[PDB]
Amino acid sequence: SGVNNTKKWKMEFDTRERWENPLMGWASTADPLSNLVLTFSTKEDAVAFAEKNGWSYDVEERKVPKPKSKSYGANFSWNKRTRVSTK
Amino acid sequence: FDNTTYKNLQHHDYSTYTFLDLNLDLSKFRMPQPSSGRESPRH
């Protein structure tokens, strides 16, 4: 339930091939950027960084949970379906 | 006027269904129940 890892903007790159090492079976890679992950305060900062480095990019708008209406009293509604059968 | 005998002895003759039999007896005296409007919260 913690939301502290959703505060900042991230920039990662497209995933490329990983293959089994013939000797041990370890995951090999030839992608130098496979682990690169940058952090940004805003999406403008991330876009600015991508633009000056020549990377083409996709920006996905931040998804924020929409505010909910909570009411403990509704658990015992006289005539509504919100009444709970168990606690 | 007497104050030396116990006058609560009827319950020595109560049985398994005494309480529910009285509830059945009282059924004809009640006012009609209110209604939530639906058969149950799951309707």
Cα A86 from chain centroid (whole Å): 35
Instruction: Give the 3-state secondary structure of chain B.
Output: CCCCCCCCCHHHHCCCCHHHHHHHHHHHHCCCCCCCCCCCCCC
User: How is A9-48 classified by DSSP, letter by letter?
Assistant: EEE------EEE-TTT--EEE--TTTT--EEESSHHHHHH
Instruction: State the Cα–Cα distance between residues A53 and A36, nearest whole angstrom.
Output: 14
Query: What dihedral do alpha carbons A31, A33, A35, A40 form, nearest 10°?
Result: -160
Mutate to test the interface with B, among A83, A84, A86 (most CBs of B within 10 A): A83
Phi, psi of A9 (to 5 degrees): -85, 145
CA distance to partner chain B, nearest, from residue A84 (Å): 8
Tokens of A8: 């900042």
Does residue A39 contact residue A12 with C-beta atoms inside 8 Å? no
> Is any Cβ of chain A less than 8 angstroms from the Cβ of B32?
no
Taking an 8 Å cut-off on Cβ atoms, the answer to whether A81 and B36 are in contact is: no
Phi, psi of A76 (to 5 degrees): -125, 35
Q: Give the DSSP H or E segment for A49.
A: helix A43-52
> Is any Cβ of chain B less than 8 angstroms from the Cβ of A78?
yes
CA atoms within 13 A on the CB side of A84: 7
